[PDB]
RNA sequence: CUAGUAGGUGGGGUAACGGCUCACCUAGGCGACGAUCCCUAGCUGGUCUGAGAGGAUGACCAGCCACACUGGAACUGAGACACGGUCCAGACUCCUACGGGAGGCAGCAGUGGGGAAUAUUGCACAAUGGGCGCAAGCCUGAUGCAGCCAUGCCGCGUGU
RNA sequence: CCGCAGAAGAAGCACCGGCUAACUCCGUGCCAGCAGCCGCGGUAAUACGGAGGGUGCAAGCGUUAAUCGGAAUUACUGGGCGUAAAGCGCACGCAGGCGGUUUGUUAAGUCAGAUGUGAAAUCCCCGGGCUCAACCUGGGAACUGCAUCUGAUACUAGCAAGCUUGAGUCUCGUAGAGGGGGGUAGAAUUCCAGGUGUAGCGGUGAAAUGCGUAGAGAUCUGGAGGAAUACCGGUGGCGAAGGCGGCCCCCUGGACGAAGACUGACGCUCAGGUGCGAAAGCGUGGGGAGCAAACAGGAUUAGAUACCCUGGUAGUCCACGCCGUAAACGAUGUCGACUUGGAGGUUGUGCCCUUGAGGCGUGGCUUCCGGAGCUAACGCGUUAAGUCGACCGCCUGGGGAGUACGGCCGCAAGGUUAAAACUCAAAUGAAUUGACGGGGGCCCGCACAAGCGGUGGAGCAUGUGGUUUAAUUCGAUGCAAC
């Protein structure tokens, strides 16, 4: 528009709202659960989920989804987050690594075993 | 929603119950053994269910459940064993066939059963400020149609006086004349709490009244522990348990027993008394109004049939076509 | 909004211009051309991205600067207000014959601990580099390497 | 580097619904689960679990975390605010921004050369060297700046020195609800003193409080007052906006036209700054007709601290002051100049047998239709939302939240300014088609209507539903089952 104006205020683009704030470009963080909560899915898109508030070390609780199917999580239970989000569960924005720390792999998935970090079979 | 897909689906859910009951460990691991329960509280998306053990569990309700409501006793699970123990964690795997239950009328939104497994439905009511037999009249038909027992309870009697009661009790005598059950009392005052207590003895029933009839007083009067707030001014699906046995589905609505339209020939069956007023009339199709030689009319203006009952019965039929 | 503040006189001080300084004088100086006040930040060449212009940055290597346990100090000196000097107050620390003392890993290696995570308490003076030295040479965790890491990149291959 | 064994010791992981390259069999049955997205699964799922088959990728792979890229997704290049987010009500003016027409001028900007400067490594052009590559090395190019010097002098700049079409000015008119102040009347009505007069009046889909024989209502006369100023009057006017309507006077602002004469760029915009602000409310103090939040009765209703009725305070009008929001709207920033028009509106005038109402021009602005044009559309379209230029304001998805907190203001309300967290994944637009109406209109048919005979009661047959039965076979049921 004008120069005039431009010289006074610079243009301004957005500053992105960080979807997480497990931050300090968190790769991963240990957290510790709280308990393993449970909550409903979304209005049409419906599934139960094993999720859990997590007592992260940087200090921010938040409930994570517990991936896959199989399980091993208590109330008190050091755990490791990753981001994520169950696009059908509000409040999820994470994802606790399966196979990490306080869990190993679930039983016998075969496909994509890295997701749900599982060994290689006996071959 | 698919009546067909709904059907085939029904069978599946049904088998799931019996199959799960067959025995457990094959089911297992996330959740624990199935057990019976009834629905006390409705969390919209959750439900509080009291177990056989007698400990309530807030549970999820698998989509596979078309619906659920208060007064629904049936099978259930909580998550695991471990999981109930930190924080009420459970889920409702399936439900049972509501043996006895009732629904609300509505306008757009269709009829929805309010509660199931009911032995008696005590109509509340209150003298403050003023009653309207109409609300009770319409309710009487409901109790007959679901083949439930009705108890009318004129409450808050302590609020009446000389020229206040002499017109209350008598005016209600109609119920004592046609064989209905009633017990004047006043929650605030705890009067006639003996008769009711006995009546509720070994029975499965609940109390619902119109706008502000002392429902909170009576439910809180019989048995009230850590929770006596449901009075207070003029204002407002959980079926609470009784002190002497029996449960009462309280949701903030039920007490306002509206009136839904079931059939046009049933209205005549609503009241047993009609069993003698529908014998021989003037017109084979005499709707009992301004016909020449009617039977119900010749009885009403004759002193036997309570006029008030006529106006109310006639209004009910005119209320349905109000759609 | 600014007090030793702005200048101007005087002196004093620095290797040197100056309020640098003391003393003296004047009463300015400053501000939307955002002073000042606040939050956050090593700076920079770069680096990544983008057709570009720009955008996001600022590891590694090189220029700059600043810091060396918390602080506040000068001295010494070519040169320092001086990481592995000095003194003081300070917090720790630690030792002690309880009188007093000793200590400084934003080096190197390793330790704790912190964390999502980042490697040996290895080797060498051979080369290059530097200190000191008259060379000799000595010293030099700079450095050359060697150890570890599929961290990235590249290649090769695991068979035809 | 030479050598010897021997296929030996060495391939993985993901993905394959669509986007987005890749498909089947089972299991599962809105469960378990998925996942970037849209979304998948409630009995044949290419998406879940398993299996196979193909696609990809490679010692490496995926995922997660990170940055920009895509994104022209802040829009210099390179967006937008008539209706989808976005023009402040509205004005005025200092900083500022922008600048009619001549010359001179400087050489400031500009330009141009030139003089320098711009570590090295990157990078790039070109080459070479490590078996290739990465890498390395050499050379060039480049690193698009600053500075200085010597000019160049079109424009911009500064000043100088000029002009006239901008602006401004004088003059002469017009029209106009421009205002402010003070008068003043009528219409009507509240209330009144009475006239007449009478049961009822008043109120309502029905009713009631209320006034009603104390004479209401009604009628007539007078009077008091309160509030607001019909018909005109308008698709009208004037105003910066908000708005401003009886007639009269006083003080006052702006707009426009015409001969003209005059000045001489004195202008445009404008942050801040200034003043003004539809209705609420405030001061304080009056007032008080009508109306009317609150409040009180009556009614309605299942309830009805509603709509309706009797009403009625606050308020309303006056002053005064304070309060500062308006869908403050043409939902359309400012000032300027342009580019097709037709009918129109109200005011001005030249000229022209006005001989007439006037004709033909000529200015103002505003309506309605409207080309090109422009536009996502609708649409707009010489009064532009076209083409432009200059200035100024704003908008950066939805909710969050016009809120919080700070601020400032303020009697208080409250205004103003304006976030975060988060959460959502789309909201939003318009246009398109149908459906949709207790919308409206337009038709007929035994729809009504016009008649005929009916059916409906009464006794009997089919049937059928209830009820019953050991069985009372199975299906057909709002007209379209009987
Ligand atoms: O005020 C309260 C009471 O104090 C008063 N109240 C209750 N009982 C009595 C009584 O006996 N006497 C009097 N005077 N008041 C009573 O009546 C009111 C209603 O009581 P509520 O218990 O809330 O009635 P619901 O539960 O039936 N109502 P909803 O169905 O909508 O939940
Ligand atoms: Zn009859």
User: Resolution of the experimental model in angstroms, please?
Assistant: 5.8
Vertex B295, ends B290 and B297: CA angle to 5°? 45
Structure tokens at A17: 């709202």
Q: Tokens 């605030």 — which residue?
A: B188
Instruction: Tell whether B210 is in a known binding site.
Output: yes
If one counts every other C-beta atom within 10 angstroms of the C-beta of residue B220, the result is 18
Residue B190, exposed/middle/buried by CB under 10 A (0-12, 13-18, 19+)?
Answer: middle
Q: Protein B102 CA to nucleic acid D30 C1', in Å?
A: 28
Chain B residues in contact with chain A using a Cβ-Cβ cutoff of 8 Å: 29-30, 45-46, 60, 62-63, 79, 82-83, 86-87, 89, 91
Does residue A85 approach strand D to less than 7 Å at its CB? yes
DSSP code string of B44-71: TTEEEEEETTS-EEEEEE-TTSS---TT
Of all protein residues, whose CA lies closest to atom 27 belonging to ligand 1? B215
Vertex B35, ends B34 and B41: CA angle to 5°? 115
DSSP B157: G
Q: What are residue B208's DSSP bridge partners?
A: B123
Which residues fall within 8 angstroms of residue B17, CB to CB, at 6 or more apart?
B34, B75, B93, B94
Structure tokens at B236: 């407002």
Gap between the Cα atoms of B91 and B38, Å rounded: 12
**Nearest ligand to the C-alpha atom of residue B216:** 1
Which residues fall within 8 angstroms of residue B34, CB to CB, at 6 or more apart?
B17, B20, B21, B24, B27, B75, B76, B77, B93
Long-range contacts of A104-109 (CB under 8 A, 24+ apart): A104/A72, A105/A70, A106/A68, A106/A69, A106/A70, A106/A71, A107/A70, A109/A68
Chain B hits for A48, Cβ within 8 Å: 60, 62, 91
Interface probe, candidates A35, A42, A48, chain B, greatest B C-beta count within 10 A: A48
* Residue A68 to residues A49, A55, A95, B62, B81, Cα–Cα distance (Å): 10, 21, 10, 19, 21
CATH 3.40.109.10 given to domain A1-123: no
Buried-state track A47-67, b at ≥16 Cβ within 10 A, e below 16:
ebbbbbbbbbeeeeebbbbbb
- First-to-last alpha carbon distance for chain B, in angstroms, is 25
Backbone interruptions in chain A following residues (C to N > 2.5 Å):
none
* Beta strand ranges found along A1-123 (DSSP E): 29-31, 34-35, 38-39, 49-55, 61-65, 79-83, 94-96
Residue B272, exposed/middle/buried by CB under 10 A (0-12, 13-18, 19+)?
Answer: exposed
Q: Is the CB of B187 under 6 A from ligand 1?
A: yes
Question: Solving technique for this entry?
Answer: cryo-EM
**Nearest ligand to the C-alpha atom of residue B279:** 2
Instruction: Tell whether B71 is in a known binding site.
Output: no
Subunit contact B60:A46, Cβ cutoff 8 A:
no
Structure tokens at A104: 């190993």
- Cβ < 7 Å from nucleic strand C: A 8, 24-30, 56-58, 80
Domain boundaries, chain A: 1-123
């Amino acid at each position: 528009a004008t120069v005039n104006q431009l010289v006074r205020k610079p243009r301004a683009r957005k500053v992105a709202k960080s979807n997480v704030p497990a931050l300090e470009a968190c790769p991963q963080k240990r957290g510790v659960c709280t308990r393993v909560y449970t909550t409903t899915p979304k209005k049409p898109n419906s599934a139960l989920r094993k999720v859990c508030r997590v007592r992260l070390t940087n200090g921010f609780e938040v409930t994570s989804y517990i991936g896959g199917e199989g399980h091993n999580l208590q109330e008190h239970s050091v755990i490791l987050i990753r981001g994520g989000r169950v696009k059908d569960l509000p409040g999820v924005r994470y994802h606790t690594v399966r196979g990490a720390l306080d869990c190993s792999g679930v039983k016998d998935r075969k496909q994509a075993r890295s997701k749900y970090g599982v060994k290689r079979p006996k071959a | 929603l698919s009546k067909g897909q709904q059907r085939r689906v029904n069978a599946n859910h049904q088998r799931r119950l019996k199959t799960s009951k067959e025995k457990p460990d094959y089911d297992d691991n996330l959740f624990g053994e199935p057990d019976e329960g009834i629905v006390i509280s409705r969390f919209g998306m959750h439900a509080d269910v009291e177990s056989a053990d007698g400990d309530v569990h807030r549970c999820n309700i698998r989509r596979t459940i078309r619906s659920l409501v208060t007064g629904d006793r049936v099978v259930w699970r909580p998550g695991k064993p471990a999981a109930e123990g930190v924080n009420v964690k459970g889920i409702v795997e399936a439900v049972h066939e509501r043996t006895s239950v009732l629904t609300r009328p509505d306008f757009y939104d269709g009829v929805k059963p309010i509660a199931a497994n009911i032995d008696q439905i005590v109509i509340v009511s209150a003298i403050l400020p003023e009653l309207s037999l109409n609300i009770i009249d319409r309710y009487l038909v409901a109790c007959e149609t679901l083949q439930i027992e009705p108890i009318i309870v004129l409450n808050k009697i302590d609020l009446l006086d000389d020229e206040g009661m002499a017109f209350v009790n008598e005016q209600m005598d109609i119920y004592r004349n046609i064989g209905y059950r009633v017990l004047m009392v006043s929650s605030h005052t705890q009067d006639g709490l003996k008769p009711l207590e006995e009546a509720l003895t070994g029975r499965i029933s609940i109390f619902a009244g119109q706008s502000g009839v002392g429902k909170s007083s009576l439910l809180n009067a019989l048995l009230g522990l850590q929770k006596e707030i449901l009075t207070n001014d003029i204002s407002d699906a959980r079926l609470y348990h009784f002190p002497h046995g029996g449960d009462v589905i309280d949701s903030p609505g039920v007490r306002e027993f509206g009136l839904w339209h079931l059939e046009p020939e049933q209205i005549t069956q609503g009241f047993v008394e009609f069993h003698d007023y529908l014998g021989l009339c003037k017109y084979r199709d005499c709707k009992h109004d301004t016909d020449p030689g009617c039977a119900i009319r010749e009885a009403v203006e004759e002193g036997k049939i309570a006029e008030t009952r006529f106006e109310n019965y006639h209004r009910i039929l005119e209320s349905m076509a109000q759609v």
